[model samples]
Target: MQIFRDVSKLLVERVDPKILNLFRLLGKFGDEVNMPVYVVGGFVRDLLLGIKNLDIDIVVEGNALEFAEYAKRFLPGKLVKHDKFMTASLFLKGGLRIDIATARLEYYESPAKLPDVEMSTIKKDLYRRDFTINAMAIKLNPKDFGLLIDFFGGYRDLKEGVIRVLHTLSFVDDPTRILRAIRFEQRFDFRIEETTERLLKQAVEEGYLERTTGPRLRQELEKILEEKNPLKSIRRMAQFDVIKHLFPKTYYTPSMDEKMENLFRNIPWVEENFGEVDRFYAVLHVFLEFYDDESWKEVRDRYSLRRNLINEIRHVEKSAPALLEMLSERVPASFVYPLVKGVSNETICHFLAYLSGEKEGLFKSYLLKIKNTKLEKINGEYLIRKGITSGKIIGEVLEKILMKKLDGDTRDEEEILEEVLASL
Candidate 1:
């Protein structure tokens, strides 16, 4: 509840020089436009928390769209404006993004409604935020540089390891905060305050969760699933029956908890042993296991999931199980080469989490060792060069050579061509 803390030194020490320079430039722009500017909300919070976050959100006490256009001149980025919300976003090279918004009051038309907005003071802007922890700001102007603006008790709650909503109707106003609450709780290892926990339940009881549109709900779910330990956060959501209410069919069983634990534990192994893993699919694979084909397809349509991602998940559901069965039956890696070949590394990591005993060992050998061995000294062209006239016959010859290489039947390119020429 005090605005005395000057975090200027911390920003200088911890913040990137380029970023600090950007902040100074924004301050200069504010002076030129005669508008007050400050970096606010999550960026300020993370600055105090000593987290290495790169996102910068600037709150302008004037037209944010105009300010954002001017701010873009200072930084090398393209500015995109949302005229309705009086907000703008600058997307920079190397994936750095900054958001600028007008400091204004927000009034919801009804419970679980999007806000009807108007330009107002910074105090009103901070007051409209979801949580006290995200309601703080730091001045970026030259005179008040790095001045901590704590209109609420954000600093206090943050220090005490508590996630407290700004008001009781926080969840009622927007149910997505319920997911964010649990997500922040797990992400920062914080506890929801007693009153806030009660408010969370009350919102569910009042059917606030149902008031959200599909896309907003999906957005929150995506964020929840993208967490480092999504299982933990989801388990917390399940405690409130949120998962059951929203996704009635899928159950987060104890076995799922175990598999998630295995995933977190083995993820380091995946990075070291395997190549790039599309972890999003690996997480979805767990859910798809519980989901019926029809249920999963509905989710795909609802979310407008990427075609490649859908296809990969489809493969996991359709092809992965049968291939997993072969591994269980002690099928040699060579025998299953064609089955596992051309599959994404993400599905392989998913299987790594699922398979156990000798099956696990088989994949470790196959994926890490045997699978990457490429033996293509004799191709369809080479076969034709040796007078194998038929295209279909050339294809058959190529397949046989690849199989021989996998089975260790041939030692080198010389041996492969020898076998090929002799067979011809």
Candidate 2:
């Protein structure tokens, strides 16, 4: 609490009055409702680290949903709740997401599942945390904006760059902490404190996967995916053999490895605006990509993945080998376009560019070759609907002609039809 004196003094001198106004509003609300509330968790964690955390999180020792209702009247955003966590969020302006949660203690029903809860004091909630660096909270009362409530010296651990678990039973409480610990450590390029490192080893040895499920595994994967260098987090998870616990035995096959390696090698080229389809396809390609059709549903179903994500991974299983096998000077655009037919231009270009080690500015130039492509005047569909037949004979002729056109060998529709009709 003494730490707040200097910090709050600095804020009084430096912060805009608007920020003070919001804290004043929260403080007044707490007073009016006779509820104890504090701005807690990562926001406090950030302030103590001297880095600004944009998303403000307020925790109430009363009904969080009610507070959310009150917040929506003033906050510039939509209020939404994850009832499963008893936490409500406001997706705010400037991409900031503010969260409010009741000050509750959680009791896990089983490993890595939702927790049953009851509102309690700050210490109880802090004790329930996995790591010391996340256990600290700050009081958000208008009079206490810069006050840091650190019972676990989370600030110290954070400053020390050590990822340390709070309790000895941490991994036993929920093994997902294993992945989280790896993420935190790799993210900051920090060392896991010796005791926590020992516990991580035990967590893996105890076979906690038997106590976990698919969806819980994905929740951790999603967080890692959100990281800037997900491969670092992933490799750490794999290095610890935790990947075995997260995925399954069938995932160990070769096709998956090739795609994952391909993905890891090329992830640097992924730009911020490549959109979800391009990003996921690139990541899923690495996440999956094994053997043949049999493993398709297996790998897809294993992650309990979404439809689009599964489709993307399946595309990798279906396409990358052919694309990689024949990329070179004057390779047919036929080979390139089909390989990329279902993918985004960014992705196809990314693959082509990476295989050749193209620089960032040149990514578009490589893709330009693919973008210039169009099916010659008569397509297979037109050929079938307007011609002698619509069966396998039509299919073969279309494939042959399209291949030629993609290769830049023919430009005329009539020429394509001549080839098609000859085949027929």
Candidate 3:
């Protein structure tokens, strides 16, 4: 409803030098070309929220393509153009990005279809945004540069800590906005406006996600899971019943939160102590915990998960009963290597979340120590030189010695050689 101008210092002095330099250059370039530009959408929203990230979205009142061409020399990275949408994305050599789009109007031709884009004024550009909190822009044209432009109630809504769509049929127009809304709510620790909340549930009940395919849903879920604390957004989605709609029977269990909290808390320690862990798989495996075979197959087919990934997940599932039994008993340090040998390290890392106490300790020990301890100073070639002619037999003998070494049955190359010759 009102504009908050006079934040030039905030943009220039407060932000990183690279972003500051880009804005200053763009502002000056806009002046010379007589085209007006503004920083809009998430960048502006984050600026207001005191959250900091790169990848700004810029709006030019005239042809963004021309502005992008003019600005390319200033940015040392790649310039990618979407001529149809009059948008250009600039990626700087320093690994930062700025998305340039003309002040354009958008309207959906059909539910869940790409919106039609045409040039328009800044006000209309702000008008067509998904949420009021994201509907504000900061003018970067030389004269009015740094003036906060709030045509909608974005500023007030940001202050009120609520997520409200620009219109009632926002979800109907593009249901992906539904997931984005849930994401931002938990991300900023904000609430969805009551009506928007109602519409979200309605959208779910209407089977809106049926229009959304596995890849698209997977992309959104990736965004959520990649967050520092995905469980926060995930729990919110469950409250809205959106998570279940996306992947039925994927709801949280009683210990899910506690496990997630521990998972995140221990990730750094796990990485530092246990070596690098596959974070993405860690998050995914947590969600699929205790899923019945039917549910696992359903999720795999629905999401079109990579064939290899599905195979690995199934391997973990198939191996799980025996592995669990082994762990429940006295799992020898030596007995683990062969059992876990061909399994993906990612699945092994994820297995930590579902384990407890002594079992968890054993898994950690295997990862950090046992897994790395192999038959050093001895290999197939060494065995071959020792009169072992069958390659298969040599490999088998090496594995045996490695397992014995792991079991503390033998140490040193001489002892291992003795064991090998004795077996021969």
Candidate 4:
């Protein structure tokens, strides 16, 4: 239980000056209102870990709405309050956001019911968090400003590089914590404390995760995949058989591990070349590629995946083998365009991960040159003028003309028309 009387110097070193000044103003306002306020949770944890985290969270001992309203008098921001949850957010310019919440306790009346909440002291509030490293706070009231609060040995656990649940029922209260534990564990290169590990395995063994809804499970799984190194956490999930619950009949394999590693390694290049790629979808594609058609439908319904994403996955799965075969050799733009014209950038990136050198260059050529190629000298009107009045025949002729243009076989309008007329 080490308490630093003032962490202002440390805060100065870590936080940007403007944001740090905002914290100072808020602390000064807390004193004026006679409400004890503190910067709590991840912000404080990251502050100590020397990691840059700008998601500021303030816990007020009094009404958060009232505190935010009063602070708005001096602070320059838009305050939005959620009355039901007793939380408020202050949105500042440049996309900086500060979340303010009342210090409170929560308990589940039944596992099925959402946790009931009530106002409580900061100690009680910290006790309700998922892990010790995130259960600490720094006082913000001017009188005791910058005081470190460690009721749960958060600092010690943080220094020891361990993730420890605040209490035994933490996972039982919210099984999502199981996934969170693994995420934080991998993110910080920390190990779960011995008792917490045992409790986590026990929760999984007791089917606690099954109590969580599909959307909630999906959210957690997506967050895990969104991590910089999701493979480690995913592998951990497999060891605990957690992945089985998320996607039945699917399990992590060494081959999949290699694929995932390759996917992450090339993500920056993919985004650089193809614009922004949906990392969630990209990673999900790799994982779901192993599922059979029936299993795909099952997970689709389970996760309530968007229609576009579902369609993309199915299209990519159906076309990948043939596309890979075609890309294996140096194919012309005309040959590659039909196979990949409507494919998502994420799927293309997935394929790119499996290819290199000339094959990779050929695939990139489609994105750069072939995808948007249009018929330069042929159209329905022109084809009709040339005695091709049937719509179907006109469409086929125009398609042929476009393919010729894509392959660089014809560039000028007369040459394209001559070739089209000759083909007809």
Candidate 5:
């Protein structure tokens, strides 16, 4: 498989010996116990796929807690336990997160409910997984070095590029698994096995998606929308009629999600800026054209979305249409510097980008911008020249000047003060 070749190339050229030694150390500890322990789940999958996975998953068929507790002695990372879950974590080795869980079986009280889990054999644990590729385990004991634990035909599934559910009732047990299946398939370019596809259709025919709670449903939707090339996954959801069930009245009308696809297409490889807060307004702005009537409120209520996100969405929903028509060309920071002392070039850039996507010139020209107008020009002496008294009045005058500056005019500092004088 190309997967093996890619990973082999990585091993031959790009591993850090220190990190490898750490992994080998843990693998060796499992060997000491004579337990058929392995590095399984996402970590092993990433290893074979030649990806750098975060959070190593250690699975032990016998005595996981004991293994983790003993292993903690060697690692400087903090250890914490959840006896009920029979799991522990070792945090921070080269920033590696180590999760140790017992190879366990589960019994769900009802479909879509969390299960009561208990220690079980590796075979039972494999049977409990949602997918075959994730079910394969890598043996680390001395007797079976480099040996793989694949009692469930997981290796075959991997080579076949198929994602098969553990059981038909698995989706009924957790309908969210339906979306997760789509996610993994897109993430790894696999096919849903015929049986699994049949089950997905069965769940759809049964209307489980409609019955799912809004919060849980929205959580699944968010995951789909946030993945790499999320548009493809979302389109799959739309094509399967899952979106129709989830938004019965809306998805069918005027192709609202078609517009969503347009917006998603325009996204700038967005994950690169995942933590940037202001980009919220930028992203939400795209949804304004399609939102109106009770449907907007209904969708908002359905997601149980946070007030901040809603407030932001609402702002863009109201502001963006008018922004498209606006033509106020903002003069650069020098134009406003005399009027406002504390505002930075970055602040102007932000306002410009927000107003009309017209501020790109200033940003490129400066090549260096501040986040807000935190001006070093203000303090005390600068205020005196602008004919402002100190203290609260100084602050009040500065705020007035920024308001004028943000109006997208003012060719220089004198014009800013002139506008400030006019406002007074």
Candidate 6:
């Protein structure tokens, strides 16, 4: 591994100017406070790779809470400090976030023991990281500003495009790293080092992931789905036989993989036409499409999916397929309105992936134009003024008039009022 003494030039080139200034300010503050500060973990890893990552993580050799509190005076942001973990997060005005943590060491007391954490040096802090590429740090102290610290050959592994764990028991310590390993491997298009791959497989075979809580497993899966392209990572998860542990009854199929790819490919179009799509929910919807009701219930129980998500999933599952069948016959806008009026953009996007030709166009029209159609000149109060006093009758009249408007059957306010009066 070649030594990288200083990468200040790389920092200046790759980092955003605003963030660079923040780093400089923090470096000066670190010197003044006598606490050695370094940007660590994924931020440092991505910096070396020239990947634009803004999630800055700072590690302090002293109390991060104290350093962060003092640093906020210069930075001017909301500081949320966690006393027990010696960690703090600063949220700046424009949505930049920096997490500060005191350097700490983690060691398993015994073979069966959970890891214990204590204060430590930068070297120890990097040692506790999941992969070598993520174990490097760059000094943010003014004296050694942008000095790359590679204690575990992270630079070499990064240059070599290898994901290597820091220790043999890394996977045992946290099996979620298996998911992370695949995520980073697929993300950077890097290969998992042979030994790390073997250990990760061993952890899977030994059911280490099963020991992790459902929410943590779901959290990792959600992160995987949130990636730019989750298909590759998901396929890797299946290759390692990890999916069975996460969703035991739900099987991974080539069709599911294709569907997921299709979903991701069309996400941009969805966002452009509709709005921001819930990526995690949309991708998970594709996966859940293959699930039986029993399997879905099992997943919901295991992951503790939020009631809102559950309801949305249930709605999509029940509605989209039926809607798809109904739309097979080139239905009118009035016919399509009630079917899709309340459906989510995410589900609509997911449903659109299954359609093509006329059906796809009709669905797009519904999303873009038809769903927002309304009576311009008539409402419940207006109907009451016209002598339809029953609330139920007024609601029905408004619904019928809106449907006529959607179908282009009613074009003017005079015609709509005349139709309402004639119906009365």
Model 6 TM-score is 0.80
| Error at 143, model 5, angstroms | 1.6
Instruction: Give lDDT tens digits, candidate 1, residues 1-424.
Output: 4766888899999999988988988888999898999888888879889988887888899988788788777677887877657878999775788888888887777765556454678888888888888898888888888889887788999889999998767888788898899988888989999999999998877777766766787788878767767768877987887876565565777876666666655665777766766565576666656465577666666555554565565565576678778887776556767655776666666666666667767777776545566457545456455765667766766766666766555455564566677786
Clashes (N, CA, C under 3 Å) per candidate: 0, 5, 0, 0, 7, 0
34-75: candidate 6 lDDT, tens digit per residue: 999899888888888888898788888987888888988878
Instruction: Supply candidate 1's per-residue lDDT for 11.
Output: 93
Assess candidate 2 and give its TM-score to the true structure. Answer: 0.76
Ranking by lDDT: 6, 4, 1, 3, 2, 5
Q: What is the C-alpha lDDT of each candidate?
A: 0.75, 0.64, 0.74, 0.78, 0.60, 0.78
Better of 3 and 4 by lDDT: 4
Candidate 5 ranges beyond 4 A from true positions: 1-28, 31-34, 74-77, 91-97, 213-219, 247-249, 252-262, 265-302, 308-315, 318-321, 327-424
**Residue lDDT tens for model 5, 112-211:** 5557455588778777778877876766565554565666666678778888887768888778878888888888888898889989988977988766
lDDT of 1: 0.75
Residue 82, candidate 1: how far off, in angstroms?
Answer: 5.5
Estimate, for each residue in 1-424, the C-alpha lDDT of model 2 and write its tens digit: 2333325664455444666567667766776676667876665666656666556677887888888777777777888888655788877674666677877776766656546565578677777887887787766665555676777767678778888887787887788788888877876677899989999888788888546666666677678777667767766776787766654543433444444554555554445233343444455544444435455566567666554554555564566556555553445556566656656533443353334343323433434444565544656566567756666766667666666655555456665557856765
Ranking of all candidate structures by their TM-score, best first:
4, 3, 6, 1, 2, 5
Tell me which residue pairs clash in candidate 6.
none
What range of 10 consecutive residues in model 2 has the weakest lDDT sum? 352-361
Query: What is the Cα-based lDDT of residue 10 in candidate 2?
Result: 46
For TM-score, candidate 2 versus 6, the one ahead is 6
Tens digits of per-residue lDDT for model 3, 244-280: 6876766665676666665665566667764676665
lDDT of 3: 0.74
How many clashes would you count in candidate 6?
0
**What is residue 228's positional error in candidate 4, in angstroms?**
2.4
TM-score for each prediction? 0.78, 0.76, 0.84, 0.86, 0.69, 0.80
Candidate 1 has its poorest 10 consecutive residues by lDDT at 374-383
